Amino acid sequence: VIATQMTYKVYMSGTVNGHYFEVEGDGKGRPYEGEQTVKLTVTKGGPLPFAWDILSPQCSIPFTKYPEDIPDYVKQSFPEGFTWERIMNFEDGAVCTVSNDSSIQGNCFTYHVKFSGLNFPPNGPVMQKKTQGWEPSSERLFARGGMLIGNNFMALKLEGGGHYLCEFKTTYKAKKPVKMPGYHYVDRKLDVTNHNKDYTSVEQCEISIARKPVVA
Amino acid sequence: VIATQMTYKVYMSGTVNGHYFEVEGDGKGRPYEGEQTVKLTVTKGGPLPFAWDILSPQCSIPFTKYPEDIPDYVKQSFPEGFTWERIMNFEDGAVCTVSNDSSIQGNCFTYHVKFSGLNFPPNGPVMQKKTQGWEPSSERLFARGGMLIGNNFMALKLEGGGHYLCEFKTTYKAKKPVKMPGYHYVDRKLDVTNHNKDYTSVEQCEISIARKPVVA
Amino acid sequence: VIATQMTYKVYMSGTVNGHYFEVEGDGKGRPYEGEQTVKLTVTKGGPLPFAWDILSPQCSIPFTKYPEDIPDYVKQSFPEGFTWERIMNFEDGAVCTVSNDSSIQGNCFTYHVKFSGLNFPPNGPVMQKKTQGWEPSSERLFARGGMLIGNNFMALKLEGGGHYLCEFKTTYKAKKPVKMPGYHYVDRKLDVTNHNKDYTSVEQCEISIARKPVVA
Amino acid sequence: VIATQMTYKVYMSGTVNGHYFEVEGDGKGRPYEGEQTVKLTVTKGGPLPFAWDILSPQCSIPFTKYPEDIPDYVKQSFPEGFTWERIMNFEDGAVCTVSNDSSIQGNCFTYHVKFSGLNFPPNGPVMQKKTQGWEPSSERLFARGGMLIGNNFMALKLEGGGHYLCEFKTTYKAKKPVKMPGYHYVDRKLDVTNHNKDYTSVEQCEISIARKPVVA
Ligand SMILES: [Cl-]
Ligand SMILES: [Cl-]
Ligand SMILES: [Cl-]
Ligand SMILES: [Cl-]
Ligand SMILES: [Cl-]
Ligand SMILES: [Cl-]
Ligand SMILES: [Cl-]
Ligand SMILES: [Cl-]
Ligand SMILES: [Cl-]
Ligand SMILES: [Cl-]
Ligand SMILES: [Cl-]
Ligand SMILES: [Cl-]
């Protein structure tokens, strides 16, 4: 139902401090090897007056390597698909809510995402564009009410050193009953590998591998 | 610049658990007496599969009675106007982010609002439609960085008694420097005074009066 | 059971960033008029290396004026008494947990309080002693599981202007079933009216009056 | 300064919903291999009317295996030592604040800990004793202001399945400047390996290993 090589399209719209924007992306990768790559274009509201980094993790949870002994909640949701709902709380008080809807047509995945972010302070690092990508991260995942819940302590690298913290809570909602995983983790690295001067165009590479708890 | 009787139009769109909707409203009242009334129509995505109450407070901060001894931040923002950015955190984990943009053309105010709400649990009171309006509330307001910040502990009455708590944080952003108020409160009552069977149409009445701290 | 003039004793111990301290106080006032006054001494761990203001609201909920039409949960708890449990979350990340136990012997109230506060940053206003008393405040109060729950958005005035925000959540637990109040507010002003140079001795005056919602 | 085999003593006192308790413990292990074991006795306030599990993670951060390429902030703090300050936020609203002070005398470590926990609801799993140990966990660690900050999404297993979530924030404060680590993780498993009927006596085994991010 999901082939070992897949493509995908991303339509993302939203607001940041009330500034509207649209993004489109084309991506590809190996759903079973955990790798993927995507090229995004700001099609409306560019150049963005805020850091691109807040949008990069919104742009492919089907592309996560599960070992055969951990039920892969999101792959099983197919072909009906799944949604996800996400809250990001930044340490200087900014909050975003983001939702995704994922569908499949052949060997193309389609993600529709809505992004709403606000209370980024005018002198903070998102609005001054002082961020330099995300540390690699590790999401704690567990099953509840037939849903998959993910908690991630994320951090943006800052220009001139140190970190700007963001907590992620992501709820994954299959459109049909599936076989629920036990308690586990997903390790990710997200990199911007190319971009133009004003981030109206961007390319990213992500690796994500699920695993059992490392110790015991 | 603001007459003692004013009308207004509301265009509100957004998502709740990823369900898209549009609302339009026509309202009127006495900006200096703190009273106002509005009739709303769900123009898209109706009937809504969630409680209307989560949307009612999104639908007119110009209509707040200030005593002459408290600078009225929002009226002064006119005619350039103002925006506001709002986070609502519900005690069962749901969060919404909402932004408004307010403009003026003659004696009509126009509010454009975007609403993004999610992680309302499927058996909770918003999705089961068990709520029965908001308690009257009192918002703590103070000045910082040229902005007005409002904190409100809100509560929805529940069918069969008790309360469902929601915290509001609202940041009001004038589009030009204005004269900043000191520390103060705004008391509100919001009532649904008419509606049809499925809340595709709704009418509301609100009173809001600013005051100094009651004791000392 | 509670006379119209009452005295009280306060024994408070705790830690702030791990620094242990003990306070004792002697207080008096009119439980039915909402007024009271208390003199506190730092009996151990003085002079304190942090702002006294974080301790001032820990030092008499029996002394709150209720109108006859609002059940007074805390007075009814007597003579068995009551406890309260409190969480304070400061906007720069510091948190305290505080519990009180209140007993009565004749016309003396006795409050035993434990205070635990930490993650006050070393350059923040509590540890640099930059605070200048609390704004007057207004606590939203409601009944649940036979308990009284109070939510308060508090603010400390800062040296050189502006505010340092603290959210209070206080749960009041009668030691026997009592008649539960409806949804209401309590307005307070707390003032330090005298002190010595290093706040090893302090005197405070508080007024608190319960009321119904002001508007509607 | 720290030998490859070490012993330790724990004195812990505190309150839970205002119930006072004291614990003492004797422990031993291999500070460089990440292993350790400890036997605890409730010396005052036993039997405890709440789940022991809330106390088990308070009872040895010197015993963490660092690879040679990650500065070990806590070992370097010796012999002056270190403190830590911790906030635990449980998903049903309970909060604890905990502080530790660690000293060294020869080849014995001494931990003094204070524990303050409250708003555990009377029918929740801590007060009904429905918990069954902690999932293995993984703490995100980073340097800021000369301090080490740790964020952990923890979970208690429940009787009859599912999880009760607790977020940990722990700040580690060396008593002298040390060489600061980069961004890293510590994986732990904490097990109760023996206990008597009412948890007045308890034995625990913990493994903790620091590592770099797994992916990239
Ligand atoms: Cl802001
Ligand atoms: Cl499940
Ligand atoms: Cl990542
Ligand atoms: Cl949900
Ligand atoms: Cl200002
Ligand atoms: Cl209201
Ligand atoms: Cl700190
Ligand atoms: Cl009740
Ligand atoms: Cl106060
Ligand atoms: Cl409780
Ligand atoms: Cl540092
Ligand atoms: Cl653990």
How does this structure look, described?
Chain A has 1 helix and 12 strands. The termini of chain A are far apart. Chains in contact: A-B, A-D, B-C, C-D. Chains A and D meet through strand 8, strand 9, strand 11 and strand 12 of A and strand 8, strand 9, strand 11 and strand 12 of D. The structure holds chloride ion (12 copies). One chloride ion binds next to loops of chain B. The PDB classes it as fluorescent protein. Keywords: GFP, Anthozoa, Beta Can, Beta Barrel, Fluorescent Protein, Pigment Protein, Pigment, Pocilloporin, Chromoprotein, Luminescent Protein, Fluorophore, Chromophore, Acylimine. The assembly is tetrameric. Green-fluorescent variant of the non-fluorescent chromoprotein Rtms5.
Structural class of chain A: mainly beta
Inertia-based shape of chain A: globular
Which sequence of SSEs, written as H and E, runs from N to C of chain A?
EEEHEEEEEEEEE
Strand fraction of chain A equals: over 45%
Strand order of the largest sheet of chain A: 1-2-3-12-11-8-9-10-4-5-6
Count of alpha and pi helical runs of chain A: 1
The first-level CATH class name of chain A: Mainly Beta
- Percent range of helical residues of chain A: under 10%
Number of strands of chain A: 12
Q: CATH-wise, what's the superfamily of chain A?
A: Green fluorescent protein
CATH architecture assignment of chain A: Beta Barrel
Oligomer: homotetramer
N-C termini distance of chain A: 34 Å
Which ligands, by name, code or SMILES, are bound? Answer: chloride ion
Gyration radius over CA of chain A = 17 Å
Function (chains A, B, C, D): Thought to play a role in photoprotection of the coral's resident symbiont microalgae's photosystems from photoinhibition caused by high light levels found near the surface of coral reefs.
Subunit structure (chains A, B, C, D): Homotetramer.
GO biological process, one term (chains A, B, C, D): bioluminescence
Organism (chains A, B, C, D): Montipora efflorescens
